[PDB]
Amino acid sequence: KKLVIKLSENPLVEYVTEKEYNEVPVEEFGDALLRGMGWEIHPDGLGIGAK
Amino acid sequence: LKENEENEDGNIEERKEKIQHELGINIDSLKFNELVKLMKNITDY
Amino acid sequence: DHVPVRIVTAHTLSTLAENSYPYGIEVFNVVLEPLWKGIRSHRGKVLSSFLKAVGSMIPLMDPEYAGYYTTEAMRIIRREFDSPDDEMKKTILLVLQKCSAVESITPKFLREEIAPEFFQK
Amino acid sequence: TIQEARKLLPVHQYKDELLQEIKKNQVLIIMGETGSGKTTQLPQYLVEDGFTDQGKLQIAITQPRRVAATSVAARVADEMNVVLGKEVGYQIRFEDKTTPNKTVLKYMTDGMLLREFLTDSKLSKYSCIMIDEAHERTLATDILIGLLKDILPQRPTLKLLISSATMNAKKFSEFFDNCPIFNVPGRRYPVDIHYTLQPEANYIHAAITTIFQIHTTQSLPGDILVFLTGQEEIERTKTKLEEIMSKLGSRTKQMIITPIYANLPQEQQLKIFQPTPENCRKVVLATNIAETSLTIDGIRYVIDPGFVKENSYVPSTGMTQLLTVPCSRASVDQRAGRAGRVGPGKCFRIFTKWSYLHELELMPKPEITRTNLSNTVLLLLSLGVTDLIKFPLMDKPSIPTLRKSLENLYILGALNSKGTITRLGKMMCEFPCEPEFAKVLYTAATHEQCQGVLEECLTIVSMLHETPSLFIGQKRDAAASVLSEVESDHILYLEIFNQWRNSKFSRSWCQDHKIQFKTMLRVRNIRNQLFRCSEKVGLVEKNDQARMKIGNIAGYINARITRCFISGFPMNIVQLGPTGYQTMGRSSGGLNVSVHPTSILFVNHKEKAQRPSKYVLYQQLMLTSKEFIRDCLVIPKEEWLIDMVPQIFKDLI
Numbered sequence: 001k002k003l004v005i006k007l008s009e010n011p012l013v014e015y016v017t018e019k020e021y022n023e024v025p026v027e028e029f030g031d032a033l034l035r036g037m038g039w040e041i042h043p044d045g046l047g048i049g050a051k
Numbered sequence: 052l053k054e055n056e057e058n059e060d061g062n063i064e065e066r067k068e069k070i071q072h073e074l075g076i077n078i079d080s081l082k083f084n085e086l087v088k089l090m091k092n093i094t095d096y
Numbered sequence: 097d098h099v100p101v102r103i104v105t106a107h108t109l110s111t112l113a114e115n116s117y118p119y120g121i122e123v124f125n126v127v128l129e130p131l132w133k134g135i136r137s138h139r140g141k142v143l144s145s146f147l148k149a150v151g152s153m154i155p156l157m158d159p160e161y162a163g164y165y166t167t168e169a170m171r172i173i174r175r176e177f178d179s180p181d182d183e184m185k186k187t188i189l190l191v192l193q194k195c196s197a198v199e200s201i202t203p204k205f206l207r208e209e210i211a212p213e214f215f216q217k
Numbered sequence: 218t219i220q221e222a223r224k225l226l227p228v229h230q231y232k233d234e235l236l237q238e239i240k241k242n243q244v245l246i247i248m249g250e251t252g253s254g255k256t257t258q259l260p261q262y263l264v265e266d267g268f269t270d271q272g273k274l275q276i277a278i279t280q281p282r283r284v285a286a287t288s289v290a291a292r293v294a295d296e297m298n299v300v301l302g303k304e305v306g307y308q309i310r311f312e313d314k315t316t317p318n319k320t321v322l323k324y325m326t327d328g329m330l331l332r333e334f335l336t337d338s339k340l341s342k343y344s345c346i347m348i349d350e351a352h353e354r355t356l357a358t359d360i361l362i363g364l365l366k367d368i369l370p371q372r373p374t375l376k377l378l379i380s381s382a383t384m385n386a387k388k389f390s391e392f393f394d395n396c397p398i399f400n401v402p403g404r405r406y407p408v409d410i411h412y413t414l415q416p417e418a419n420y421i422h423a424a425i426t427t428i429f430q431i432h433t434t435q436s437l438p439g440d441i442l443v444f445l446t447g448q449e450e451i452e453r454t455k456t457k458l459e460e461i462m463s464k465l466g467s468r469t470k471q472m473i474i475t476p477i478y479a480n481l482p483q484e485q486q487l488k489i490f491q492p493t494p495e496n497c498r499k500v501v502l503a504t505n506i507a508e509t510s511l512t513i514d515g516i517r518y519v520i521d522p523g524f525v526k527e528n529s530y531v532p533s534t535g536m537t538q539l540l541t542v543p544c545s546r547a548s549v550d551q552r553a554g555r556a557g558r559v560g561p562g563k564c565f566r567i568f569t570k571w572s573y574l575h576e577l578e579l580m581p582k583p584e585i586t587r588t589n590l591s592n593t594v595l596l597l598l599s600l601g602v603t604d605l606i607k608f609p610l611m612d613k614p615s616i617p618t619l620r621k622s623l624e625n626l627y628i629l630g631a632l633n634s635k636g637t638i639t640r641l642g643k644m645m646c647e648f649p650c651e652p653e654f655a656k657v658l659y660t661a662a663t664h665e666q667c668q669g670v671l672e673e674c675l676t677i678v679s680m681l682h683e684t685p686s687l688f689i690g691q692k693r694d695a696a697a698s699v700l701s702e703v704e705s706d707h708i709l710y711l712e713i714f715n716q717w718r719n720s721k722f723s724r725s726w727c728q729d730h731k732i733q734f735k736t737m738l739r740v741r742n743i744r745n746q747l748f749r750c751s752e753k754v755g756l757v758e759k760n761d762q763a764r765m766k767i768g769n770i771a772g773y774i775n776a777r778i779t780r781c782f783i784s785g786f787p788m789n790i791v792q793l794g795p796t797g798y799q800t801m802g803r804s805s806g807g808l809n810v811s812v813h814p815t816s817i818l819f820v821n822h823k824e825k826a827q828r829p830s831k832y833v834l835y836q837q838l839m840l841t842s843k844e845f846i847r848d849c850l851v852i853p854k855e856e857w858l859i860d861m862v863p864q865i866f867k868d869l870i
């Protein structure tokens with residue numbers, strides 16, 4: 001239903017890869033990373049008054 | 052009929068067929084034109 | 097360098113483009129740059145004939161480019177509605193009947209801005 | 218003497234109480250006025266006390282302005298009577314002037330001390346960090362006091378100090394859990410504050426009126442500093458003043474107009490520092506550069522309409538917007554203080570005392586809520602901050618501001634889909650540029666369709682940091698004299714620098730083609746530093762293979778440079794639509810954006826009649842009066858979009 005990603009807390013990855021994006025879309029990563037952390041013109045010339 | 056009315060095109064017979072087909076209800080063409088004149092009257096929407 | 101060779105060339109393009117429909121815009125694309133530098137630079141017999149050539153090319157174009165050129169074409173026609181010349185009036189009518197078929201031009205823009213002045217002229 | 222003059226400063230008489238206050242507490246906040254001496258004299262007293270002593274650790278003094286960090290360290294060289302570079306240093310972005318063992322107190326800037334977290338998190342070298350000018354609230358300052366709140370449990374011996382303005386210092390103490398606020402109220406030459414009794418209609422006219430009210434009647438020698446908003450309202454006031462100065466009679470003394478703002482060239486910015494001669498009056502127009510940055514001698518009279526110009530990053534569509542706002546009460550009181558620099562001075566404010574209390578605000582805007590956060594999230598995530606909402610920061614970024622920076626690191630490939638910083642993302646912390654720019658350099662080396670062109674991408678990326686202040690006057694007048702075949706605003710930058718280089722870095726070449734020579738010095742310094750860090754990562758070695766092993770020197774160069782700037786900037790592409798250009802994002806719809814009058818794509822679309830290219834890459838989506846686009850780049854082929862970034866454009870095309 002909803003996707004939730006939590007970070008690892010304290011060997012390297014060369015690239016994200018095509019397969020990874022298919023599972024977690026780019027729209028979904030912005031919500032899911034937060035949810036894993038617990039989200040759930042002035043006119044040309046006037047004075048400061050100048051009605 | 053009213054929601055799109057402000058920017059409608061000239062072909063009333065294609066709009067007559069889209070309403071009749073997306074709703075699956077068959078209306079006589081002469082019966083439908085009665086209501087088009089009733090809907091032309093309505094002021095507030 | 098002569099102007100009446102430049103005008104008879106633009107009438108020939110509008111003939112060729114109308115006999116070609118719907119094909120051939122790859123061929124006619126190489127001439128769009130000198131026609132619009134003639135439309136913005138000029139008046140009179142070069143303006144009305146270059147506008148006619150561009151007006152017959154609009155139907156051969158792709159939706160994205162057909163809408164961009166039609167928008168540019170309607171600003172010239174509205175600036176030039178009053179003109180008494182027969183050669184310019186005959187171009188206004190060609191551009192109206194082609195740019196009617198473009199999805200960019202709404203039925204409401206024609207009723208408020210274009211059509212009350214078409215019927216009085 | 219100098220030792221006699223140090224006793225004249227206000228903070229010296231409070232010193233004996235102040236040392237016991239620092240030794241007892243850990244975090245202390247100093248509430249002082251400008252000119253109190255809390256910047257200069259304070260770290261001197263710790264050396265005299267023997268604070269550092271035998272120990273290796275040295276004091277760091279953090280200031281937001283790079284120019285102010287060098288200039289204050291010259292004064293401490295005079296007072297402690299040691300030459301600059303030893304026993305008194307400064308470490309800024311370009312000119313490190315330090316000795317690694319004999320320099321005690323170093324006056325680095327705010328962006329420097331964040332970078333030392335990236336290697337060494339606990340700050341093992343320092344005993345006493347003094348933030349200075351913390352009411353400026355730069356982006357580097359808010360993260361630095363955000364991270365130093367976490368370090369105080371890990372080190373109980375580190376001292377922290379903060380110099381602050383009066384109205385901002387209350388909010389700091391609550392952040393550090395009620396640490397004591399010390400006070401030094403040192404103020405020189407008070408200013409009398411004059412008001413208008415009724416609100417005005419058009420403040421530019423009343424500004425012109427009030428100058429003549431000072432000019433025709435008041436005592437001499439007197440100078441006038443006015444605070445207009447931006448460039449465009451200075452030239453309109455410069456022109457309207459030149460008419461009325463001539464039309465007035467020959468009896469009145471000469472009036473001189475000398476505008477200052479940041480983008481105006483260096484040759485004219487030196488004209489304020491020249492002392493005006495007798496029988497003539499100097500009137501200076503200025504933006505915000507006068508109030509904090511630099512000091513003009515002889516300014517008695519300051520006219521203040523009360524308007525600033527600020528930029529708010531709108532994070533949904535990803536566009537900055539730059540509007541005119543009424544400035545806060547904090548910045549007004551900074552503007553009046555520029556009057557009393559030499560003697561008693563007047564300050565004229567074009568607004569009423571009722572409006573000054575009830576309409577204006579106290580604190581202007583914290584800069585972390587405004588600007589883009591895509592660079593600092595990667596700084597935080599590399600320092601092991603797993604939780605960003607609960608991160609103990611002073612003024613929280615909004616959640617869409619913080620969401621958009623997390624998608625934008627995921628597109629570039631810095632963050633793995635599990636959330637881990639990848640190999641590429643560790644490099645972007647190292648480079649002194651944005652996370653977008655450091656991927657342009659990375660696909661300029663490694664990526665298989667864009668290899669070998671890293672020698673040119675270092676040139677463009679260096680130029681794009683300095684695109685406001687390149688050209689003297691209009692761009693196309695200087696663009697056409699250089700070359701006449703450019704179709705994109707990026708390849709002009711590669712060509713201007715390459716022809717400035719083959720002229721062996723002449724000063725006289727720049728004045729031929731109307732280019733600011735001072736700016737091109739700064740582009741050369743940025744280029745050399747990006748070239749060092751690309752050696753140290755190892756991109757230069759993988760670069761040079763792809764030119765020798767694959768020879769490509771034809772017109773394919775400007776098609777690989779285009780390919781690199783798509784992989785770096787993939788959200789910034791527009792599409793040609795019926796109204797104009799529309800933004801091609803999946804979340805943000807078409808905003809009907811229009812090319813800025815400076816760009817080369819604006820000359821080729823109006824002065825010539827090039828048919829518009831179907832896609833355009835931009836560098837900056839800003840709206841002054843209309844949604845504009847700057848620093849454009851023609852993308853001819855549509856299939857470059859799918860092949861370079863398939864994680865976005867396999868869907869949208």
